């Protein structure tokens, strides 16, 4: 019997992944993301748009 | 092809090697002696066990003088050990019974006495043909 890691079995599994389970999982995740979105919608420094500082074993002590 | 049934679901095998089961067909044998189960795996210290629908080597220890002490293949038809069926039904038989069969599938006898398992009947067509009671 061919091993579970055989090249032929891997190629057939990849073909199955790209041709059969692909669209099914795509539509599944599409409706899932749709329901996710349904539930979800259901001065620079002074405003915080500019990223600033909050609040060393890489460099030798100086 | 080696004498191993193809297309059989898992079940609780209840007939070990060396088992005295009673005979089913009208060949003349009174009992069959399970001595070797065809298709069993190779595990040390593990006694090969057989279930309904498996051809098992059998030896007539008690029977008509013509057929006594004779080794031929035989397939299990009835097992008293409880086994479950894919409809979720646990069932078991009164006795342990098998019908003498040649390695192709022609049964030496002509009529099968008593009931017959669905597993044996489905795996072997002529057992269904010459079996008068299958449940």
């Amino acid at each position: 019997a061919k091993s579970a890691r055989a090249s032929r079995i891997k190629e057939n599994h990849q073909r199955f992944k790209k041709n059969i389970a692909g669209p099914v999982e795509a539509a599944r995740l599409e409706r899932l993301s749709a329901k996710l979105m349904a539930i979800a919608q259901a001065s620079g420094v002074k405003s915080g748009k500019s990223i600033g500082r909050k609040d060393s074993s890489i460099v030798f002590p100086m | 092809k080696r004498g191993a049934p193809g297309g059989k679901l898992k079940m609780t095998l209840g007939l070990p090697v060396g088992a005295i089961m009673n005979c089913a067909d009208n060949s003349g044998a009174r009992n069959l002696y399970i001595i070797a189960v065809k298709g069993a795996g190779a595990r040390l210290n593990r006694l090969p066990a057989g279930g309904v629908g498996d051809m098992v080597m059998a030896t007539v220890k008690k029977g008509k003088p013509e057929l006594r002490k004779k080794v031929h293949p035989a397939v299990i038809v009835r097992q008293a050990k409880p086994w479950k069926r894919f409809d979720g039904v646990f069932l078991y038989f009164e006795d342990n019974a098998g019908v003498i069969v040649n390695p192709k599938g022609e049964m030496k006898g002509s009529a099968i006495t008593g009931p017959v398992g669905k597993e044996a009947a489905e795996l072997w067509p002529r057992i269904a043909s010459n079996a008068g009671v299958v449940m």
Binding site: - | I35, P65, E66, R68, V71, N102, P103, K104
Partner: protein, 560 residues
């Protein structure tokens, strides 16, 4: 799994008449009045030659080795003088007579003979066989019998368990010693021989004398006298013989041809032997089963008796044959020496015997009391050297094919080939059966493997037998028709086969490859071969037969 699990159950029947190197009514033999009355009640009016020759020696107290077939009266032969010597029960503790037999059935037969021939006497006889209660055997030994009939293993086990003293035994009988040695009882037989006191009279009754048995008798018997069944080796002049050179692939068909035309056997169940009485002797039990099934398919009334067959089955088969419900009896060698075979009219040996003396026994199985008998042999190219050993042993002139117009089939060993047309038709039908029914094919394969093993395990022939076997194969008579097929046949086949003989004697000029390195090797090879110049369960209230079962339990408790 159990296909030749241990060994072919019928191994061989080896005989050694070199054991010969060891050295008219009951009222005339003067037995006691009570013994004479018992014999008359049993119905023994005229003694058979075996006891006629042995009983005076046993009364003279000489050790005896008796070559006798089953059924000749060996049991009576060794029990009558034993009773005549005993004459009474002894008040002193200790057994006086011991008989050792292979199987419980033979032990029971001997026990019945002893009881019937000793009706009236106060002799205590015991049976010690396997399967009986050891406590019961202890009680019997406590009751102190004078005569013991037992199997070697059970007797040794009882002796070891009870520390029995055998010094009081003066009479020892070994029934079926060749069977004892074939079953392998030799070790405990020697142990019992060592345990027995030297001052004893030993009788050993056997149908065959193997070399191991001869050595055992030489080591354990004091000046044994060998008595034999008269002219058991002298081939009867009323025996007609024909031998057929047959190939393995056509050999079953040849057997069918002999059954159909040479004997003209009727087909079906027959409407004390019969007029035909066809017995066939083979090599292996697998051959026995194969030939039996093939012949019942062909339509014969066949009974088969092989070595390791169940006791009841073999009795039923032998009863059917002896009462004439079957016409063919298929046996190898072991069941043959075992069972009682009546007078036969046709004997055919499928597999040629290794030993000329085995052949002599198998052909003396027929043509008895002045009656004419027929014997047909199936001989192959590999079996020819044994046929040549046989012709040396018998001292008969060899007639190959049709070298003589009217050969004497009784005094001359006549070998020939069978008729080609019917041979081929039977071969075709055999092939059709083999292709059609799978059971026969499996039997063919297993009997072929058994025949291969028998070829490896068969005793070899002599160098000179192999030699003139080669020259016989070279000779023309090997392929010629048998003398039984007719002078008109001789005419047609002589008109034809001569150019066919030229065809068969073709020396090709060059092989088809000669017609590369392989071709060069073939040419050089050619130049090299260039010719040289129990209580019931407790009653349950809910159970229907509650009160009845309670009553049963109470009754069992009262019985205790």
């Amino acid at each position: 799994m159990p296909k030749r699990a241990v060994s072919p159950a019928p191994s061989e029947n080896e005989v050694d008449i070199a054991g010969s190197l060891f050295a008219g009514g009951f009222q005339a033999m003067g037995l006691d009045a009570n013994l004479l009355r018992a014999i008359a009640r049993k119905g023994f009016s005229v003694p058979t030659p075996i006891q006629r020759k042995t009983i005076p020696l046993i009364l003279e107290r000489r050790d005896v080795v008796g070559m006798a077939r089953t059924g000749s009266g060996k049991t009576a032969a060794f029990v009558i003088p034993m009773i005549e010597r005993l004459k009474a029960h002894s008040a002193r503790f200790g057994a006086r007579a011991l008989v050792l037999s292979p199987s419980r059935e033979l032990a029971l037969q001997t026990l019945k003979v002893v009881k019937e021939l000793g009706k009236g006497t106060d002799l205590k006889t015991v049976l010690l066989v396997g399967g009986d209660s050891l406590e019961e055997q202890f009680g019997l030994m406590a009751t102190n019998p004078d005569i013991i009939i037992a199997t070697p293993g059970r007797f040794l086990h009882l002796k070891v368990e009870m520390s029995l003293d055998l010094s009081s035994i003066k009479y020892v009988v070994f029934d079926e010693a060749d069977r004892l040695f074939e079953m392998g009882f030799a070790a405990q037989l020697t142990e019992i021989l060592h345990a027995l006191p030297p001052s004893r009279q030993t009788l050993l009754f056997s149908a065959t004398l193997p070399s191991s048995l001869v050595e055992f008798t030489r080591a354990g018997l004091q000046d044994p006298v060998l008595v034999r069944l008269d002219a058991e080796t002298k081939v009867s002049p009323d025996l007609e013989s024909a031998f057929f050179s047959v190939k393995s692939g056509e050999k079953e068909g040849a057997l069918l041809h002999i059954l159909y035309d040479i004997i003209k056997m009727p087909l079906g169940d027959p409407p004390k032997p019969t007029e035909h009485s066809t017995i066939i002797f083979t090599a292996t039990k697998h051959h026995v089963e194969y030939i039996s099934n093939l012949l019942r398919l062909a339509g014969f009334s066949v009974s088969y008796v092989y070595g390791s067959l169940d006791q009841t089955a073999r009795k039923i088969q032998v009863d059917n044959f002896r009462r004439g419900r079957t016409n063919i009896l298929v046996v190898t060698d072991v069941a043959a020496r075992g069972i009682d075979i009546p007078v036969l009219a046709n004997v055919i040996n499928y597999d040629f015997p290794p030993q000329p003396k085995i052949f002599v026994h198998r052909v003396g199985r027929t043509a008895r009391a002045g009656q004419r008998g027929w014997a047909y042999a199936l001989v192959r190219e590999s079996d020819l050297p044994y046929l040549l050993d046989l012709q040396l042993f018998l001292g008969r002139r060899l007639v190959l094919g049709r070298e003589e117009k009217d050969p004497s089939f009784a005094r001359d060993i006549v070998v020939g080939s069978l008729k080609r047309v019917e041979l081929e038709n039977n071969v075709e039908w055999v092939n059709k059966v083999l292709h059609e029914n799978e059971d026969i094919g499996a039997l063919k394969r297993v009997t072929a493997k058994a025949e291969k093993l028998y070829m490896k395990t068969r005793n070899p022939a002599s160098s000179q037998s192999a030699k003139r076997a080669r020259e016989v194969i070279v000779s023309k008579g090997w392929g010629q028709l048998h003398a039984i097929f007719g002078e008109e046949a001789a005419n047609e086949e002589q008109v034809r086969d001569n150019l066919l003989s030229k065809i068969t004697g073709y020396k090709p000029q060059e092989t088809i490859f000669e017609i590369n390195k392989a071709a060069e090797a073939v040419r050089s090879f050619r130049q090299r071969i260039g010719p040289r110049k129990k209580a019931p369960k407790e009653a349950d209230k809910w159970r229907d037969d509650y009160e009845v079962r309670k009553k049963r339990v109470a009754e069992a408790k009262e019985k205790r």
